[model samples]
Target chain A: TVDQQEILNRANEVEAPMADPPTDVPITPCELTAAKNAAQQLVLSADNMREYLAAGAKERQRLATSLRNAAKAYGEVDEPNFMDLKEAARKLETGDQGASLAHFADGWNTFNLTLQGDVKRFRGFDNWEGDAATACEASLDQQRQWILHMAKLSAAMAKQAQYVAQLHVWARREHPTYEDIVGLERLYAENPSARDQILPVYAEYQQRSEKVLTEYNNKAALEPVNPPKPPPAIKIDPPPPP
Target chain B: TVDQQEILNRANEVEAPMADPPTDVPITPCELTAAKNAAQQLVLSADNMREYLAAGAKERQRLATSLRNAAKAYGEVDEPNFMDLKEAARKLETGDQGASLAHFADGWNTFNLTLQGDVKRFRGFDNWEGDAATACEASLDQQRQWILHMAKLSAAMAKQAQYVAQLHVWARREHPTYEDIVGLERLYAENPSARDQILPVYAEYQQRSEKVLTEYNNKAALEPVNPPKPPPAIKIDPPPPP
Candidate 1:
């Protein structure tokens, strides 16, 4: 059994806290898949950057700085789809589709801009002579894919906004009390069309989400690799006489 | 109870996986304290950076990018100490103070250089012009404290290198299996003085770690504050007359 102290101390190795307790709310499968794809790429991208740093001594220290910067950027975001869907759900529940759409759009734009920042930051080698340009370009390409996957997620989440909003309410109460059941019945009664309407779409969305996840799993799956360097080396003294 | 899918989705959230089964080894109380202090500061630093960004709209996006970079750098290093100590213990068991001292010194130097990278990178926002200067300055100052606390952590970790190395070997055997207990007995036979030698130092390091953590907590404590702006507004259409 690992000591409690190791667990407690080891968290310093990465910048972000691992997702905890998770979102107590429902997350659409599409968004979930997209978030996973992006995160997996992040781990892969970091792995690649580590490789780049290890291969050369020229700008090694400086490149390590860039690698850490890029890693932090990726770490800063986790399951963004969760937050995006949550915000979209909040707005749509109030029957404000325009605002909800706008929120999704805005979040999408922010993600794009952040990726652009990453590209610019990665290009910071005094001169993009050789490895610098090649490595930074790879970094940009990885982040671009990150955004594309996230966009797919947003598109999927947007498609199912109406159902997810209602689902959010229902999932909160495992058992409906009189008022809860009455409120739901009245809602369906007033908008009878939606009663049978949502589930088909919900079913369709779930199927779509599963496909998205499968696609992502295929795309972002990490290959077997080693970190750039072994644990910082132990300096050896001259060997005693044989 | 949490859903299985949520847990799977969350594994993608961090660059490094959180301790899986934890390690099947023991960690010193001082390292544990140091780790906790560092993790606690991270939550605090993140909160402070969030506040700083929310405090003003000027350079907001650029600032957010910077904030995330800083966060990732901190995240990338927490597990290094555990590995270092373990490896160091392996070497020192046969007893070579010079190599052990060199190992700690090298890791310490690497950490210092990393901080220097942090300081240089934080200077990305050129001259502090007006509120921009003030905000960037505050960010820099907070990060400086972050590095200071990390330095304190490294100092404490280095202080316990000798004992930590030995402790690592002992903790790995788990439930004192015959081999584990036998190994322990043999270790004491040769290094009997170390029995009492390690504890007082570990205690002293814990005190130092706790104090460093406290100072960070006090200073990095987020203030109860609000963001500079509300959500992007919706231009709502007026309802038709009933």
Candidate 2:
């Protein structure tokens, strides 16, 4: 099983630093610099967040594949819990964190209950043959391991979901607004002394804006005005008794 | 003259409270409440900001009207400075803070320079007729007052523009994303103890979201799909000049 703890720890390390709003009524040069730093930090954090979400989604899909394989191995291929795990994985891929978390909890709970029953049944088995005993022991071990692994994953997911939610709320409450930037620019313009410190920050933001705009424009240009229709399906003759 | 100071003071009073994310790894009931309070504050702040912007736009229009009238009275209707002032006022109405600030500064600078020249010319006037002196004094007094009034308005606008810009940047950077709310919902579902505190906040947000959606739908419905064309101009006979 993948180290779910390691993923959670790594996610914890991906800190989105909060930029405190300047308390000064007429914000000083030092305060403006802090705001600039915050803005820069936020951009970096957003980039990191995107990377984390992508990686997390990939991890989820892998987990889903594992769950599907486990279901097949245990002769529970048609189980609703396995189906839900797959669906939950898909949800995470599409940024539906809430539904994904709910499904993870729901699917895991049922899977865990079934695994417990299987473990109990295996423990009660007596007078097993050489290959039969070996197979039963191996299956029981796998089931127990899955139970432990899934419990850990469910806990980790709950924590991650909460962290992401709190992060969003924090970002909204704490980040500087358009009005703050305008103020800083006004101050920078009026106070030439502050220009040396502030101008570079503004320039960086402008460059980022231009880059984003260019990327968007390029994407738009690359898209077909009218998307080509998919090629018509070709009929293939099946061999008679092959 | 509009009370520019009063506007600035009122704007200052329009507070957007910060919602601190829960510090606890497993957040407690009290901490969740604080987050809820912060979210509520943000909604209120957004509402107030819209109102402020609307009122500010109307005020700008009035100021522009006053400037145009002043230009005509002073026989400086063709002046570029006056034109810029009117344009600057128009920019504010459309929420172009940076451009509006620049225009206001540009227009006021030239206008101030011209006013200075007028004041100097009037100060030097020695020989004056009864009506001429009275009319010249009145014009000079009005010009001087305009300089003071405009300078105050310009200062106030710079401050206001900065505030609005900062507010926008802050809201974008700080506001909660979809993932954050999901996390909260998960927490609420898992911990029944926190539900009573968190559920109300979620309900309020949901209501606000619905209201906004309804308003948008109503607005869309009210708009004409194909607007009616204006009636054709009626043909009229020209009257003979007296």
Candidate 3:
């Protein structure tokens, strides 16, 4: 079975159809379809990429917590070492890079050494079974995966955005003018024979324009109203944890 | 000064040129430009929306830590109450909804009471100053902002994506095909008088195609190779936290 990472990579690898159409080449319905399809695919892939990252981050957090617990069991719970380990685990939980990497290295090294010296001691604590060293290694692997995956997905999305932007530029240059449609109408009105030829194209243009306007209106309506307010302040006795 | 939420709302409110062209009206260069510009604007807005959400999530994290500290000061650090608060704080830090809302309400009510009974006693413990109740209220406010902003941005993006997808469908329907281009070339090749009109349009299409193909190749090359491995395991003494 393909892992989440494999699926993410596949999403990133999805290719967009080339957006350029020669200036003289009239923009075809097929070309527009291709561009639209490409944009849709990119958007879908971005959604998938985000989901995978969230899942990876969640897994990393679970491992980080396990590692921290193992470290606390080996050292004094409130000592600086254990506290530092806890902080590192928190950083890893977010799946962001930079500080997370530095801290994870520091925390993992400390825990690895403690495990090396006395692996058996941490085994039974917190209902944990199996080798502590292996768990630590898994966390380490996860950290690297999170970092690399984040990097690749970020780059892929950036490129997709750039291509879409370029496609828009091309589309803008190729669109027909209102006057051109008027001229066509003039021909259809004055000449009985050409009406059959011009009517279909004219109707197509009108329908497409209406669709765009409607979509735009719908999008505008999505604008949010008032910003959210903070919850009301009221006095209530603190309840003990259930 | 304008806040990030205000800016995001403004971005969402941006209007795109209506995509509908009346059937009798010819598509104009200006209309194409307008549509292109609208798409570009939407893309930019999406980027800004994402940045704001990230910042909001980060701020929420900072406040959650403060709240967790306050809660710990009032109760046993390892008690179930404190642990539950910690878990709730973690959930809030991520800026996700669902479980976070339930947990935050539970944790906040407990901490609010702890502060209510003995406000002065918890002072000067962790370099904390001012009213604990006020600080908790600020955290609550930030949480609401995070949730609302997240909701608005998500809806706006989904709408934008839908609009773009629709735009692509229109483009596909309108674009000229290979046969149309060949016919245009035949007209250009056979008639010297029309060369000026045909050459510019032809050159535009060719240039656009080249640009799109180049971009596609560049994107394909960006595909990542070799997933990262876990850090190597080597024995080193656990370093004391500095």
Candidate 4:
């Protein structure tokens, strides 16, 4: 017989913190899926980006960067979507469609603008039917389709966004004194380093701002809305590697 | 006693058809994590690119496009560190320090050069430490960290690349035009009558190329990689409102 005990022990070893009490384990299919998805996101956010970047060359590196950026963006978002959707659903639930049309239209415009932002930030599609499964008030079958769609679309989108973010992160970590800064390293190695420094002066600010926003929001997802801390920054005393 | 099943059933309703089965039966957490991460990445990639473009706006679009090209150029290389490490490891494992040190130094130089490329591409940081964990792997923990890091990075890159692919998909599905391909509905509104139009020029070739690649390798990453089985003309056919 298979050593089911080993499997159980591994699981327990892995998930000791989240284990439920004997009396209150709902253990529903939905909870399990959500829990599973959430855990999946955690691991991806934690480990996968470096693998993508480690692809042995340029084209592979580019593909890897995109994949990582997409993943990062998605990771930043999972915590936010809980609220974003709740707000959207609440608005739709409460606001009269006709009355809210203006707001919705404005939101629609904003969403369109956001779509452009989405493409720019991550460089992908914008037709958001929102996670088809969770979008409607229907049977589990409908929910399943929605989940699958969300899974497919979100995965694709996240991959791209993660790539973008990876590039952003990579860019942030290096000083392109003289090198090409593209999919992997700085591409402009010989591009007159004196005049050719970084273009985005405030990239750091934006990063910090978003970091604060995401951190605060993630915290607030569970607790009452506490103020977000200022964008995080760690000043390095040791010199960067040669 | 706690009526856990009732609550559980309610939760499962959330995923419904948006998901599929072997439902609640346990699959490996890693597999689940990988799939969900894949889905999440897709959405993030779209969002990230959109954000990047939007941040750039009309003025920055040209620069952005150039940057993107640079990224693609750099991405072409399979990143050096992963490749370099294999050789280094071979030496290190066999207890050869002199040869390993030579490769290590060379590898380090290339990796740093790669970081230089990253700086140029996104222009975010003052300096970067390329593959810090991997380059300094004296312990098992450090090796694990680097591996996880690389995996995480790859996830983002893959997702982002997919996002770009999706953009091409959207362009084909909606506008299929070169001169004026912007957003979703806007793309649709552009000659809504030209749905069946031959996918301009770029679309067809790339699609075919990608399809062939997929056929050779993917076998089934997506439904139909490319058949050119005629697009449905938009034709301003608005039958009803949902």
Candidate 5:
């Protein structure tokens, strides 16, 4: 693995003005990034995924570790928090029902959160691979629970948005003030009532959500699930002479 | 310390964004940002980790305060009504979040509630070098708790029904967990206590996160590595064999 037995001499020699091969070697995120970017061009362009995966031997090795760490982070914490229902309910102000719009920001942020969670997951992965596995701070099982919540929420956001449009309860970007976070949460928070003064954001969400969901569920049956990609058979293909 | 300012507050703009940039640029809360944007390049590159740490802490404080303020505004209800619908909304259980989103489970949607929240304030991610800097307003620090609540309602979704499968909270089966902007903030403001436990699942939903984090932190080293990347070029003698 050692390219040079004496790195000091090599480094010093490279630093010399007369040296043919400059060797004041430095590794930085930028240089690695440039190399990775070059590799990305090849891998992203290739039609064959396996072939793409095969390239970037050393860089990909490091990247694969990082990527797997990210993946592991995604795996460790996927559970949802029960508190949010009440939180959503509080925001919506409608008891248990609400719209997906209420959770949109969280859902979007979650994508970033998942991106960040790699730190914890990365440490865990290396720990499990080594001897002192039990000393690891968090287990993969625990990590799975973390993101499980975000994924579930992402699904909920999608579901509620569809229902609101279907039900006609959710007016998307209709009211100017309503769209403002200040105005939206104002009904309660803005109120200086000594009694409590805080606004109920969740119940409002619930009322709107229920309205849309009721309209949607009551509507016609759901359209067929879109094939991820077009089906291999033609639309006119006879059912294999059933 | 007085010296801390010279160390930490180098070119710090500790105030809300007043100097307006062009429209469509993100409004970065003036805390000192270093992200890429349309109008200008943020000149912020610390020479060492210490400088980075000093700057990072300041940035984090600003973001945290904004998030806390936004969360508090929605969840903490003060307006007591005859029906108490707002209060009731705050008490909804985790199962109910899934129940609420039952409609619109199948559909393609951008966001359930599309809010054109004063994009003018943030020139669409222009000056994000500050504390309140963000790609968008709904970007976490400004996301009213109402949305945060919905996403936090459960554990990371189960692949083939793992974490939430036993709970019968399948992603495909749930939808419309929360409603509009008015609803999301209330959850954060009101029931942050509940999130303490539930947030865990979402942090690490994937199974291998424990191992991943361990690897990232380098906790799994077969032998203790020398000082988190050798102490600042201090001279040291060769170590004796273990």
Candidate 6:
């Protein structure tokens, strides 16, 4: 019987280099089913995905527990082989290709977990495993989309806020009026599911304000108050008196 | 009695070198009063400034007519000297001392009429002439300010419209949604008094979309699909176990 002491540190210090895993490591049918069930549960149902995502700390541990339990049962009489499989599963989970899958026993991770999902459809288990697997994969894709959306929106919101800040810099007294501020805040925040009323007003104001300021600068340049002695006052010959 | 024909063109080809304007040309007090009234009215009242501005062609001729009539009545006997003063006023109007202030009574211009405004103040006429002179000078300055303001606003409005067009270039379909279009229109039109709501959304959306797209482009550069490859595989000894 395998115990906790037997499973820990069994890979690096293999107590026994056993013959290749025997054709059958003796285990009751119930234990075999139990182990398979543990492997299948590692990926949560799509319905429970939100819950699983929220509890990352515990869920991460549950995954490791299930991986270890399933492989443990598969190689009950092959302790060294079982430990190698556990190491390989760990490597795969962490995306380390220098994994221990070199040994035949090192194959109890997700890649080998379709004990029934692939065959059950050919059996009487009514495809629950396959459906669950598909559901979980879809859930994973949704999570990826959610993460990208969050990352994109965070940046989006920041840009909107920055625009408001620019408006403040150029507005009279470097601040929008009380009435105008709502539209400003709303536009930047990307709040108000529907299009906001102030978009045109604020945009126009910014555009016009920029224009007026530019015109003022250009005209001011021309007037110069006290122009440069006008190049010593050239005298053109009175155009021969038209 | 100098009828209209006598004073008509007695300038360069002098039909008569009449005695210099006797410090007092024998003119009726009523005529003097009437001439001063015409000169004073040359500068429109602030209340009628808008109407005056609107009818440019007619108003310009009317202004010149008043200036000529007023000066003509005052200098009926000394036509050449009066025409010279008219020339001086023309030079002042055009900011060119070299402008023709002499043309044998081609003096139907505002340059001379202020003669009353200029002389009545010099004479014992109540300060009304002086007041009108000062008032018209101030009015001219106001017109300068108004001219500059108009030039500035025209460019400002154009720039605002340009900004909206730039935004449209960057919008999702290179076109703003109906809600967003209002903001674009309002901003450039300078109407509706208040800011619109979607300007920030559309503006921010474009900014963020650009950012995300840039990120994707960078990532894609790192991973090109259908990459060419030599038909080769080589394996070096793997690193020792960690």
Q: Which candidate wins on DockQ? A: 3
Q: For each candidate, give its TM-score against the true structure.
A: 0.19, 0.19, 0.27, 0.16, 0.19, 0.18
Off by over 4 Å in 3: A1-55, A79-131, A150-179, A191-242, B1-220, B227-242
lDDT of 2 by residue, A1-242 (tens): 33333323322322222122111111111112222222222222223223333333333333333323422332332311223322322322233323333343344344434434433322312433344235434544443354345434434433433333333333223333345455655766688887678776665544443333223212211100111111111111222332
In model 3, what lDDT does residue B229 have?
Answer: 22
lDDT of 5: 0.26
List, in order, the clash count of every candidate structure.
Answer: 12, 22, 32, 147, 137, 15
Predicted structure with the largest TM-score when compared to the true one? 3
- Model 6, span A33-112: residue lDDT tens: 21222112211111122222233223223323332343344354330122332232232223211111112122221212
For candidate 2, lDDT tens digit of each residue in B161-197? 3332333233223333345565665776688887568
Local error of candidate 6 at A157, Å?
A: 39
Evaluate residue A161 in candidate 3 and report its C-alpha lDDT on the 0 to 100 scale: 41
Residues B32-80, candidate 5, lDDT per residue (tens digit)?
1111110021111101212422343344345434433433333441221
C-alpha RMSD over true interface residues, model 1 = 15.2
In terms of docking quality, how is candidate 2 classified? incorrect
lDDT of each: 0.33, 0.32, 0.36, 0.27, 0.26, 0.27
Query: Can you tell me the CAPRI class of model 4?
Result: incorrect
lDDT, candidate 1, residue A73?
33
- The alpha-carbon lDDT assigned to residue B198 of candidate 1 equals 48
List the candidates ranked by lDDT, beginning with the highest.
3, 1, 2, 6, 4, 5
